[PDB]
Each structure stands twice: as structure tokens, then as C-alpha cells.
Design an enzyme around this catalytic site. Structure first.
Site, mmCIF file in Angstrom:
data_model
loop_
_atom_site.group_PDB
_atom_site.id
_atom_site.type_symbol
_atom_site.label_atom_id
_atom_site.label_comp_id
_atom_site.label_asym_id
_atom_site.label_seq_id
_atom_site.Cartn_x
_atom_site.Cartn_y
_atom_site.Cartn_z
ATOM 1 N N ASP A 1 -3.638 5.607 1.201
ATOM 2 C CA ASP A 1 -4.121 6.647 2.232
ATOM 3 C C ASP A 1 -3.436 7.910 2.074
ATOM 4 O OD1 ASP A 1 -5.284 4.403 3.406
ATOM 5 O OD2 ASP A 1 -3.721 3.897 4.645
ATOM 6 N N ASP B 1 0.710 -1.135 -0.146
ATOM 7 C CA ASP B 1 0.067 0.020 -0.121
ATOM 8 C C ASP B 1 0.708 1.228 -0.084
ATOM 9 O OD1 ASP B 1 0.791 -0.220 2.644
ATOM 10 O OD2 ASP B 1 -0.635 1.087 3.385
ATOM 11 N N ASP C 1 1.104 5.634 1.218
ATOM 12 C CA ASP C 1 0.753 6.465 2.275
ATOM 13 C C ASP C 1 1.110 7.790 1.899
ATOM 14 O OD1 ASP C 1 -0.785 4.394 3.804
ATOM 15 O OD2 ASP C 1 1.393 4.089 4.691
HETATM 16 MG MG LIG Z 1 -1.816 2.642 4.582
#
Ligand SMILES: [Mg+2]
Ligand code: NA
Length: 331
Positions: A255, A194, A196
Site C-alpha cells: 500500500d 503485507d 505499507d
Molecule cells: Mg496494507
DNA sequence: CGGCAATACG
DNA sequence: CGTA
DNA sequence: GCCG
């Protein structure tokens, strides 16, 4: 010597006890599956100790004096050194419980409790979950639909493409706003699962109400497959981006976090990780220095005052710790 | 035993 | 419950 | 599971 807290020692991304640490983290992960957070934490810490060592562990005696290495963790390492395998670890690997819990908990929107409930109900596969879509949350539906992509490693090249996309939308939503890559990739990881980003603006207060504008512009470009917004706590959005690929595309978890510039150093520190590093850092802060640390600031409960920070270096100084660059926070 | 990071928001 |  |  070896200090007890992970925040007290440099922990590089790659080290000299990969096999041993990986085995201990299997047990950590398994402990969490059974609701044993205490045991998970210890196994995580022990594994991190080995990551911080300057050379391979070859003998059991080299574990003497090392923190978080008691009877159980030493036995694991001992068996690995002697036979090349640890029977408990192998027993966990092969078990239907571990494999199913690991499969379910990797789904976006599914935690241990849900995974445990599903397992007890007799569910074992992804297709089992897909056959009963009525009982899934929208978050879980998205995680299930994009499971194959989300389980595929994100490359650093992918991250750079995503950043320019985010910076483009951020630049239009608020001129002067900045985007900072955080999380695992800031710690030097060449691949991850992922991405961020941390967003702020040099003028305090201007960052307010930014994320809805950013998300709207990202949605207009057809880049958002899933969006979950949290209002200001920083304002945050947990997204699934549509990332363009050679002749196609893939889904990526992204995110977005917005913090006022005054709190940016604390947000950067918290979101850079690693997860274990941050837990250890905050545990150290409270128990050794009597100061309360989170992603927003550092509180002195005695004087009832918050520490002002202009940088991560400031924060380490406040805590009386030697500064650690992100690539040495891979606890 | 008492603790194990943090704690608001969806 | 989940996200972080 | 480990620490104090
Ligand atoms: Mg994250
Ligand atoms: Na997850």
C-alpha cells in the site's frame, strides 16, 4: 491495575499469554464471520488485555478486575487453564463454516458479505471460485491468481528490498520526497502479510499528484502486477508488487499513501496500527476527551478547530495519553 | 438500550 | 460491494 | 460480549 482502553497501555509484540489470546481471537474472528461486530470487538479487546499483562495467567482469580472479561471470556480462559483446550474454540476450528469463511476472506477483494454469499451458494474451495471466473471482479481475480503468494509471510528482508525500490521510484517522481515504512513492520514485526508505505514532502503542496508519477515509474520497471489508485482523503494506491526472489519472484501486497507533511503525523499514527489500537485510540479520543480523531487530524467539535501536530508525540499529548512507541501499539 | 473507529474513494 |  |  489495567486501564480499559488499549491505547492507555503498552502492548508488546510478544507477551506471556499467547495461547489464551490466540484462542480468544479465534472467537473474535468467528464472530466477524457471522456478522457480529460487537462480539468480535469484545473478544479482540479481551485478548489484547492478556497481551498487555506482565506475566502468564495461571488462575481464574487473576481475571478479576480485568476489563472486557465477562462471563464468556472468563469461561474460555477457565477451560484452557484446566483442560488445555476450550471446546467452543475447538468446535469453531473444526467447523466447515469457519474454515471456508477464513479461506475466502483471506482472498484480496473478498470480504465477509461476499464470503458468506459464496458459502450459502455451496462454494467451498479456491478451485470452485476459479471454475466461475466470469462473476469475479478484477480485484478478486488478482487476489485469486496471487493467493498462494499473498498467503505466504513477507519477511523483513523482503520489506527492505521493497522500500529501496519504492524510494528509487519516489525519488525520480519528486526530488526531496520521503518514504516511511509503516504498518506492522514499523511495530517491530519480523514477518507479515503485507507492506505499507507513507510518502510525503517537506514542502507543503509539492506532494500533490505524486502517486500517478510513482506508479508509472514502477510500472515501467515491470514491478506492478495489480494497481488500484484512489485520488485525494489522501491519495492512495493498493498494489501487488512483483518482488524478486532467488532465481524467481513472488507477489506481495503493498500500500502506498501520500500525505501533505502537515498531516503526516496523523497519517503515520493511523497507518502504523495496530487496527485494534487505532480503533481504541479513536474511541478514547471521542468518548473520554470529546475530540474527533482520524488519519487526517484531530478535531475539537466545541471550538471547531483542528489540532496542529508536528509529531506522534504531539498527538498523544493532545489526548492526555502517555506516549507509546510503535512496538508498544501491538494491541 | 446505545454504542462499538473511521469515511472517502473505486 | 470492495480497499484502507 | 461487554460497558454504562
Ligand atoms: Mg496494507
Ligand atoms: Na483481505
Amino acid at each position: 491495575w489495567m486501564p480499559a482502553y488499549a491505547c492507555q497501555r503498552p502492548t508488546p509484540l510478544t507477551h506471556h499469554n499467547t495461547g489464551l489470546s490466540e484462542a480468544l481471537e479465534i472467537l473474535a474472528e468467528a464472530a466477524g464471520f457471522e456478522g457480529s461486530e460487537g462480539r468480535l470487538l469484545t473478544f479482540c479487546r479481551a485478548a489484547s488485555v492478556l497481551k498487555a499483562l506482565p506475566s502468564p495467567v495461571t488462575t481464574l482469580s487473576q481475571l478479576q478486575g480485568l476489563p472486557h472479561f465477562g462471563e464468556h471470556s472468563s469461561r474460555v480462559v477457565q477451560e484452557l487453564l484446566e483442560h488445555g483446550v476450550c471446546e467452543e474454540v475447538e468446535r469453531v476450528r473444526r467447523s466447515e463454516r469457519y474454515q471456508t469463511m477464513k479461506l475466502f476472506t483471506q482472498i484480496f477483494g473478498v470480504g465477509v458479505k461476499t464470503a458468506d454469499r459464496w458459502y450459502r451458494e455451496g462454494l467451498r474451495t479456491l478451485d470452485d471460485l476459479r471454475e466461475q471466473p466470469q462473476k469475479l471482479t478484477q480485484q478478486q481475480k488478482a487476489g485469486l491468481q496471487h493467493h498462494q503468494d499473498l498467503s505466504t509471510p513477507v519477511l523483513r528482508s523482503d520489506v527492505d528490498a521493497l522500500q529501496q525500490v519504492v524510494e528509487e521510484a519516489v525519488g525520480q517522481a519528486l526530488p526531496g520526497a520521503t518514504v516511511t515504512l509503516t504498518g506492522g513492520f514499523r511495530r517491530g514485526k519480523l514477518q507479515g502479510h503485507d507492506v505499507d508505505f507513507l510518502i510525503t514532502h517537506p514542502k507543503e503542496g509539492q506532494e500533490a499528484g505524486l502517486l500517478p508519477r510513482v506508479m508509472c515509474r514502477l510500472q515501467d520497471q515491470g514491478l506492478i502486477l495489480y494497481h488500484q489508485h484512489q485520488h485525494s482523503a489522501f491519495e492512495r494506491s493498493f498494489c501487488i508488487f512483483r518482488l524478486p526472489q532467488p532465481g524467481s519472484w513472488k507477489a506481495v501486497r503493498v500500500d502506498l499513501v501520500v500525505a501533505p507533511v502537515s498531516q503526516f503525523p496523523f497519517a503515520l499514527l493511523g497507518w502504523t496500527g495496530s487496527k485494534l489500537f487505532q480503533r481504541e485510540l479513536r474511541r478514547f479520543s471521542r468518548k473520554e476527551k470529546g475530540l474527533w480523531l482520524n488519519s487526517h487530524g484531530l478535531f475539537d467539535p466545541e471550538q471547531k478547530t483542528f489540532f496542529q501536530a508536528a509529531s506522534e508525540e504531539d498527538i498523544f499529548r493532545h489526548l492526555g495519553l502517555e506516549y507509546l512507541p510503535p512496538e508498544q501499539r501491538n494491541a
